[PDB]
């Protein structure tokens, strides 16, 4: 019984926004895949979920504990989520057709530090990189600008995803 | 949320057919090959199990083999903020749309023959623009349209109710019911019509029928009619019953259901007209229902529903009526031109003003009749040009009544078999029994004088023989 | 091709795109479509010179003009050469 | 020349059924298993290709296997000196007859299970006596009955016309047409009905239908109806139209064809009654045609054809009518009781004497109406016991008319929505438009007062719910 089982019984049967302040390790993947399995079991609609991490080793571990599904769930890192769900399908709609679709993410030689020259690089030579300062994100700023600028990105990202799991 | 139209640009017998659609579509007509090819075109567009076999040489028109097969379907995609299947399409379509065309979506199918391996490949495209349609992505044997749609083909009912109740919440379900009246008693066809048109389980379907009893509760439905010609020409009408005509909707549908499967429909008011016209057509043209003729009962519903339904589907409508006057409620001496307003309504005009006639009390048993008939005579005289405009259409308005025009065709025969000074006065006392007594005693060559008269050209247009 | 796309009303942008040098131009035809859609204003006095100038800067084959820009000008002069 | 009856003493679902037959037999009903088993019993009796397989365990009732299957068919054999098929039977039957029974022939089939080889053997006998039937002789795989009869089974028409014209003069040809309306347009069903019932190529047939349009020219036919119960009970009627009812035969058949496929038929006169009754039944019992109810139009044909047709087949018939008076031709002041004679005719009585009423000239616009109404009142008063005898059947006779009984159920509602001193007088001026105006303004709980009233028990019998 005790704290483990009563916290599991509370957290599994919730339906709202949840904030979990855990300890060091001890199987965060276990509670994550248990809540994901419970949410996918209780849902019979067409909506899917999105699990977000940093290292894709955790992503293959999550889908290994999960199994196989064709509902359309997204398991991976947040860079891949922003790239494949917000930036790539709607870059031609949010900022005009003259901005290009097919592009390569490379953050190994890039150290530019402005938004203006950043989307100049994305328009002219179609490379998306990173900011110079470590505490920034050009990709997430561009995703926020796409979401605020494009209607159909809001329609897609509301009509597909039901819950978003942040770790 | 709602389908818009389908354009078939090459198929087994379609040259270039653009059929407007809706939810709850019902197709009917004379040739069954065109209807089953319409349903097979829908199956080739939306069903995976039929699309995987591809096209043969016989799926092209005239086996011509050098023409591209194109089938395009349009959706509305506009009614958002309340609808669930809109999200069901948007979540899978992903970034194939533009924010300028937030509404209106296109799904298309293309095919071109190979002529070396003898195989017609089927390529599916989608997009919100008429051009620049991109291919539908898919990994193996399936694509995204298989994740969107679920097609149920029913060919020989309550199980699908609870099946859609607890399952198929993931996908938009489209029914294709092909001839459900085969080996069904007519009470079951009426129940099936009630289930199809009132219950909300059947949201999108494409029906094909040969029975009038399975269209008895038609509302918010798209009526689609294929013609009797060899080349497929298709007509379409958006049928819904107005709320003012809601108390008598059942008896409107019970007549229009039999009227839809005809080719020349003549609209009459009472059953005495029915008795006289079947007696005449028994001797003159004994087969007329074989050739597509039909006699329709209206009985006081302004002709506006029936003519608007029959004109859009390409069915010729002939109207014969009389200009009677109706007394207003609680007011003596004022009358309404009922027949003239009824004929002027469907061309589209304003209703005529209320006409008063000064009639003293005295006696009103018999003299009031001709006191109204000469008023009808001068009313018919003053509107001669509108009567000619009616005769430009198939509207035939009598001078006084049917029986007065019957006396002007045969008078001596009716005088002989009635034995009265005025046989018309004996005809309008008991309209049911005296007409039966007339047609029981009316011999041959009395019908032919009725047929070949100027006031009975409605029967000549119903028969439809082009002698001249 | 550009005058046939401008003065007809319905001629497609890809029909004009199908002649420029080596073609295979995707995603960049709207860049010139904006410029020539700015040519759809009538404005018969003097805007054709600098609009065709920035068009030929966009589409290359530069300095093939001066006489030819006037030969192109005299077509739409009076708004129609042959109605 | 003519078939007499078939007795099925054991089959797949027949216990002991004795169906009277004729030439041109048409069977219909609710359960399809009984109809297809009737046609399979005829095929087992007369077709060689079905008889050669024998019976299985499932061809006995309840799979009981210990009961003998017996199927007997009777012929008339009397109409000689002019008929050709009589000689066609006599020449092959040879010395299986007696001179005492020169007419009436029997063909019988017997079967008993073996219970060791699991096979039911079929033995055929014939003879003119009920007992002492001898076996039909035959050399190899055939017998003499194969030389007599030729059976054509048609299951999904003009080819069989010239096929019977130039061939099959050797053998008596029997058709078994099973459901010919499947995938047929209704004009083709009307043409098929005309071919079946007027053209003499089809002499003997056994039809089974689910469509009213293929019985439109019914004459000299045997109507056979299977019931809706699980145990097969069968009703039979010899339908032919009398020569006096020959001018209006088409509109008689066009109503009786839809009336045959019902279970409770209510007979009314005019379309105003139709409008009022579907308006009431829309709110009270919204499904009635789904449960087997039907409203029949008569319109002045003495109720004698319809009741005699519906009573023999086991269909309940309810009649509601009024006692109106009809003026004679050329005689002032003499009247005929029309409704009373029409109700007294079908129980079987003499027509009542012509009743005269002394009415002075004066005015006849409005006082003549009430001057006929209290005479109708005293006529209804003096025949109270015959009215009770009518109520013993399903005949309901109004005191004066429908609208006067409607005013006695709801008066204040009609006074409110009509705005007149007498609403009944406004109702009988324009009977079509004013009834529509009534039912358009007649709300809910006005229908329930019509339903629960004593003079409207016909609707309660049409619904048929056994509350008491």
Q: Are D14 and D234 in contact (CB under 8 A)?
A: no
Asked if residue D321 belongs to a known ligand binding site, the reply is no
Window 95-124 of B: residues touching A by CB (8 A cutoff) are: 95, 97-99, 102
Q: B356: helix, coil or strand? A: strand
Pairing type for strands B204-208 and B172-178 reads parallel
Sign of the alpha-carbon dihedral angle for D269, D271, D273, D279: positive
Mutate to test the interface with B, among D155, D185, D190 (most CBs of B within 10 A): D185
Name every residue whose Cβ is closer than 8 Å to that of residue A88 and which is 6 or more positions away in sequence. Answer: A101, A103, B95
- Residue B152 φ/ψ region, left for φ over 0, alpha for ψ in the -120 to 50 degree band, beta for the rest: beta
Question: Which residues of chain D neighbour B326 with C-beta distances below 8 Å?
Answer: 430, 433
Nearest to D294 by CA among B294, B252, B187, B275: B187
Nearest to B79 by CA among B66, B65, B89, B70: B89
* Partners of B234 in beta bridges: B226
Name every residue whose Cβ is closer than 8 Å to that of residue D277 and which is 6 or more positions away in sequence. Answer: D266, D268, D295, D459
Structure tokens at D117: 């080889």
Q: Which among B88, B93, B99 is the nearest to A46, CB-wise?
A: B88
* Residue B98 to chain A, least CA–CA distance (Å): 6
Structure tokens at D232: 């097969």
A 10 A CB-CB count for B120 gives 19
Name every residue whose Cβ is closer than 8 Å to that of residue D9 and which is 6 or more positions away in sequence. Answer: D16, D68, D69, D70, D71, D72
* Partners of D178 in beta bridges: D208
- CB contact under 8 Å between B94 and A150, yes or no, is no
Distance, in Å, from the CA atom of D262 to the CA atom of D256, rounded to the nearest integer, reads 10
Question: Which residues of chain A neighbour B98 with C-beta distances below 8 Å?
Answer: 93, 152
Q: Which residue blocks in D82-210 are alpha helix, DSSP H? A: 85-93, 144-148, 159-166, 186-197
- CB contact under 8 Å between A152 and B95, yes or no, is yes
Q: What is the CA radius of gyration of chain A?
A: 19
Question: Which residues of chain B neighbour A44 with C-beta distances below 8 Å?
Answer: 169-170
Q: What is the CA radius of gyration of chain B?
A: 28
The resolution of the experimental structure, rounded to one decimal in Å, is 3.2
Measured CA to CA in angstroms, residue B18 lies from B21, B74, B126, C81, D385 at distances of 9, 11, 18, 40, 69
CB-based contact (8 Å) between A154 and chain B?
no
Q: Which residue blocks in B26-96 are alpha helix, DSSP H? A: 32-46, 48-51, 85-93
CB neighbour burial string for B65-102, b if at least 16 within 10 angstroms, e if fewer: eeeebbbbbbbebeeeeeeebbbbbbbbbbbbbbbeeb
Chain A residue closest to C32 (CA)? Answer: A98
A-B C-beta contacts closer than 8 Å:
50
CB-based contact (8 Å) between A103 and chain B?
no
Distance, in Å, from the CA atom of B18 to the CA atom of B224, rounded to the nearest integer, reads 11
Helix (H) or strand (E) holding D293: strand D293-297
Distance, in Å, from the CA atom of A74 to the CA atom of A76, rounded to the nearest integer, reads 6
Q: Are A143 and A105 in contact (CB under 8 A)?
A: no
Sign of the alpha-carbon dihedral angle for D392, D398, D402, D408: negative
* Partners of D151 in beta bridges: D174
- How far does chain D reach from its first CA to its final CA, in angstroms? 52
Question: Which residues of chain D neighbour B210 with C-beta distances below 8 Å?
Answer: 183-186
Q: What is the 8-class DSSP label of residue B351?
A: P
Asked if residue B34 belongs to a known ligand binding site, the reply is yes
Q: Which among B80, B86, B169 is the nearest to A44, CB-wise?
A: B169
Question: Which residues of chain B neighbour A46 with C-beta distances below 8 Å?
Answer: 87-88, 91, 169-171
Nearest to B310 by CA among B250, B254, B235, B260: B260
Distance, in Å, from the CA atom of D402 to the CA atom of D455, rounded to the nearest integer, reads 9
Nearest to D5 by CA among D20, D16, D17: D20
Structure tokens at B369: 């009749």
CB-based contact (8 Å) between D251 and chain B?
yes
A 10 A CB-CB count for C45 gives 7
Question: Which residues of chain B neighbour A45 with C-beta distances below 8 Å?
Answer: 169-170
Sign of the alpha-carbon dihedral angle for C31, C36, C37, C43: positive
B-D C-beta contacts closer than 8 Å:
137
Chain A residue closest to C25 (CA)? Answer: A98
Question: Is chain D adjacent to chain C, meaning 3+ CB pairs within 8 angstroms?
Answer: no
Helix and strand counts by DSSP (H, E) for chain B: 18, 19
Structure tokens at D313: 């087949």
Q: What is the CA radius of gyration of chain D?
A: 28
Asked if residue D179 belongs to a known ligand binding site, the reply is no
Q: Are A85 and A74 in contact (CB under 8 A)?
A: yes
Distance, in Å, from the CA atom of B336 to the CA atom of B315, rounded to the nearest integer, reads 31
Helix (H) or strand (E) holding B321: strand B316-321
The annotation places the binding site of A at: 22-29
Nearest to B226 by CA among B24, B39, B50: B39
Question: Is chain D adjacent to chain A, meaning 3+ CB pairs within 8 angstroms?
Answer: no
* Partners of D71 in beta bridges: D8, D109
Question: Which residues of chain B neighbour D429 with C-beta distances below 8 Å?
Answer: 327
Give the residue carrying structure tokens 């001026």: D429
Question: Is chain A adjacent to chain C, meaning 3+ CB pairs within 8 angstroms?
Answer: yes
Sign of the alpha-carbon dihedral angle for D136, D138, D141, D147: negative
Q: Are B386 and B437 in contact (CB under 8 A)?
A: no
Question: Is chain A adjacent to chain B, meaning 3+ CB pairs within 8 angstroms?
Answer: yes
Q: What is the CA radius of gyration of chain C?
A: 13
* Residue A156 to chain B, least CA–CA distance (Å): 5
CB-based contact (8 Å) between B440 and chain D?
yes
Window 384-423 of B: residues touching D by CB (8 A cutoff) are: 418-420
Asked if residue B269 belongs to a known ligand binding site, the reply is yes
Q: Which DSSP string corresponds to B100-137?
A: TT-S-EEEEEEEEE-SSS--EEEEEEEESSSSSPEEPP
Distance, in Å, from the CA atom of B204 to the CA atom of B194, rounded to the nearest integer, reads 15
Neighbours of chain A (3+ CB pairs under 8 A): B, C
Q: Are D38 and D222 in contact (CB under 8 A)?
A: no
Pairing type for strands B172-178 and B149-154 reads parallel
Asked if residue D273 belongs to a known ligand binding site, the reply is yes
* Partners of B207 in beta bridges: B26, B177
Q: D396: helix, coil or strand? A: strand
Distance, in Å, from the CA atom of D91 to the CA atom of D97, rounded to the nearest integer, reads 12
Burial class (CB in 10 A: 0-12, 13-18, 19+), D424: middle
Distance, in Å, from the CA atom of D468 to the CA atom of B159, rounded to the nearest integer, reads 35
* Method by which this entry was solved: cryo-EM
* Residue D301 to chain B, least CA–CA distance (Å): 8
Chain B residue closest to D188 (CA)? Answer: B290
């Amino acid at each position: 019984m005790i704290e483990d089982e009563m916290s599991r019984e509370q957290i599994i049967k919730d339906g709202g926004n949840i904030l979990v302040t855990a300890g060091a390790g001890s199987g965060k993947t276990t509670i994550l895949v248990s809540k994901i399995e419970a949410d996918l079991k209780e849902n019979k609609t067409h909506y899917s979920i999105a699990a977000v991490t940093f290292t894709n080793k955790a992503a293959k571990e999550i889908e290994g504990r999960l199994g196989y599904s064709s509902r359309g769930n997204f398991i991976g890192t947040n860079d891949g989520f922003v790239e494949s769900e917000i930036i790539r399908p709607f870059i031609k709609d949010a900022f005009g057709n003259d901005y290009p679709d097919n592009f390569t993410a490379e953050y190994f030689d890039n150290q530019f530090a402005s938004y203006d020259k950043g989307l100049q690089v994305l328009k002219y030579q179609n490379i998306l990189g990173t900011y110079s300062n470590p505490k920034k994100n050009f990709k997430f700023q561009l995703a926020l600008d796409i979401l605020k600028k494009s209607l159909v990105a809001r329609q897609y990202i509301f009509s597909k995803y039901f819950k978003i799991f942040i770790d | 949320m709602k389908f818009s139209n389908i354009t078939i640009k090459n198929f087994r017998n379609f040259e270039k057919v653009n059929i407007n659609l809706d939810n709850k579509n019902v197709i009917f007509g004379m040739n069954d090959i065109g209807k089953t090819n319409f349903l097979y075109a829908l199956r080739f567009l939306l069903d995976k199990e039929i699309r995987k076999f591809g096209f043969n040489k016989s799926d092209y028109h005239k086996h011509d083999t050098s023409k591209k097969i194109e089938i395009i379907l349009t959706l509305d995609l506009s009614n958002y903020e309340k609808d669930e299947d809109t999200k069901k399409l948007i979540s899978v379509v992903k970034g194939a749309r533009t924010s300028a065309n937030a509404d209106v979506f296109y799904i298309a199918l293309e095919s071109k023959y190979d002529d070396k391996e003898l195989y017609g490949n089927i390529i599916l495209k989608w997009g919100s623009e008429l051009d620049n349609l991109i291919d539908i992505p898919g990994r193996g044997n399936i694509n995204a349209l298989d994740n969107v749609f679920k097609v149920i083909y029913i060919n020989p009912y309550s199980i699908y109710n609870y099946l859609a109740k607890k399952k198929y919440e993931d996908k938009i379900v489209i029914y294709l019911i092909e001839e459900p009246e085969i080996s069904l008693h007519r009470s079951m066809q009426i129940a099936l019509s009630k289930q199809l048109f009132e219950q909300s389980t059947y949201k999108y379907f494409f029906l094909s029928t040969h029975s009038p009893e399975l269209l008895y509760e038609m509302d918010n439905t798209r009526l689609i009619r294929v013609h009797s010609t060899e080349k497929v020409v298709c007509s379409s009408h958006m049928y819904n019953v107005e709320e003012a005509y809601g108390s008598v909707k059942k008896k409107l549908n019970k007549a229009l259901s039999s009227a839809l499967f005809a080719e020349r429909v003549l609209l009459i008011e009472g059953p005495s007209e029915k008795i006289l016209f079947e007696k005449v057509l028994d001797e003159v043209e004994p087969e007329y229902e074989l050739n597509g003729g039909f006699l329709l009962e209206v009985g006081g519903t302004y002709f506006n529903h029936y003519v608007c339904t029959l004109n859009d589907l390409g069915i010729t409508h002939i109207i014969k009526t009389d200009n009677d006057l109706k007394s207003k409620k609680g007011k003596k001496g004022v009358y309404e031109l009922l027949g003239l307003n009824r004929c002027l309504n469907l061309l589209g005009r304003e209703n005529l003003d209320e006409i008063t006639i000064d009639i003293p009390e005295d006696i009103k048993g018999k003299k009031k009749k001709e006191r109204l008939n000469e008023r009808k005579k001068e009313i018919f005289k003053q509107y001669k040009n509108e009567v000619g405009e009616f005769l430009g259409e198939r509207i035939y308005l009598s001078e006084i009544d049917l029986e007065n025009d019957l006396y002007s065709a045969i008078g001596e025969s009716m005088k002989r078999i009635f034995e009265n000074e005025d046989p018309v006065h004996y005809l309008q006392k008991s309209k049911l029994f005296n007409m039966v007594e007339l047609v029981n005693n009316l011999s041959t060559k009395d019908c032919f004088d009725v047929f070949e008269h100027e006031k009975f050209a409605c029967l000549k247009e119903l028969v439809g023989s082009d002698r001249g | 091709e550009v005058i046939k796309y401008v003065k007809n009303d319905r001629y497609s942008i890809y029909d004009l795109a199908a002649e420029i040098v080596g073609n295979l131009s995707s995603r960049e035809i709207k860049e010139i479509q904006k410029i020539i859609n700015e040519l759809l204003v009538p404005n018969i006095n003097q805007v054709l010179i600098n609009q065709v100038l920035i068009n030929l800067f966009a589409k290359l084959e530069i300095t093939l003009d001066t006489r030819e820009i006037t030969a192109f000008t005299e077509v739409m002069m009076t708004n129609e050469f042959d109605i």
